[PDB]
Design a protein around this ligand. Sequence first.
Ligand SMILES: *[B@]([O])([C]N1[C]=C(C2=[C][C]=[C]C(C([O])=O)=[C]2)N=N1)OP([O])([O])=O
Length: 358
Amino acid sequence: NTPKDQEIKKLVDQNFKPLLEKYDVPGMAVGVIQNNKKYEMYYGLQSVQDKKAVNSNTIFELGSVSKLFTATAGGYAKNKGKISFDDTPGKYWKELKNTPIDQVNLLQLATYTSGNLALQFPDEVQTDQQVLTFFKDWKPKNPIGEYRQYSNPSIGLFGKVVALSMNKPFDQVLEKTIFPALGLKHSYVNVPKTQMQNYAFGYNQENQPIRVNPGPLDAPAYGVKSTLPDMLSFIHANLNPQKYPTDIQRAINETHQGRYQVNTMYQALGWEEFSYPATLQTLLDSNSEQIVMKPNKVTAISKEPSVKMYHKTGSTSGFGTYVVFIPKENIGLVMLTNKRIPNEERIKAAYVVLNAIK
Ligand SMILES: *[B@]([O])([C]N1[C]=C(C2=[C][C]=[C]C(C([O])=O)=[C]2)N=N1)OP([O])([O])=O
């Protein structure tokens, strides 16, 4: 005879709250959506030195969960006929016409299969001129389309091309088109002066306050900041795309389509996809050092499951993110922290909570 809000709170207290003491995490926001009912749980401090509590207004760095907004933007551009995933970047970024990188298509950039792009740009690459020079000087290594290497430059270039195709800088594509289409009110590429009071400090592994550094093509790769209420609205859109206008509806569905497999992990656009029900170990394997940090030969999808679940981890120097949703159970979860904790702890906490809820 316990209300649903209190049962979810108890499960999140049991599974997420102990991670704050264990990893010395100053602040955490955990959100659950089930049957279009949203539950918001806030713990600890957005700023230790200011003694400001995490709340519904607190802005967190999403890190690589930013890639889900880049993927959604690409899906929007494709379904409006602004790009094809069979196009090469040279069609939109003319200075890349007839260069080796112009042999790589947009889908291969978005899904990390160029065959010669690492996690990060070289440290020296900062300016737009330096980014252009990097891609002009790029040469293939592995056969194009065959090897997955998780890469910021790779989806970064996809983002930049999607932006060129819509005649707007990438920050404006998200802030003026995609965020408003998804009904997000407190989501930013650039947090304005009037919201800096709501922008959490991140905390590094010595619990020193830090925020993300500017970097080359940072926005499309890891540059989005958001609140728990906005991230629950984003999960709602992914659970119920039919309720949104055609353009963003088709954009969202585009991001759910598996493109290839690496064992039990299906690479969608931004999202990782699994046959549901998934075992905990399947979800843990998706974020192993081998999958995240090294190249892996991809396979064609040979078993398309009827029922799928989707997740994505995100990290910056000072922030950890995890988002997961299961269409069949009409349920999802968001975790935001202002200190990185191991990916495996995020995945396991979410797994226990989502499997225990009635
Ligand atoms: B994204 O967030 C890709 N990603 C992670 C990072 C990162 C992680 C930890 C520290 C630092 C640093 O100190 O700046 C950066 N940069 N890009 O995805 P994952 O790692 O898969 O969740």
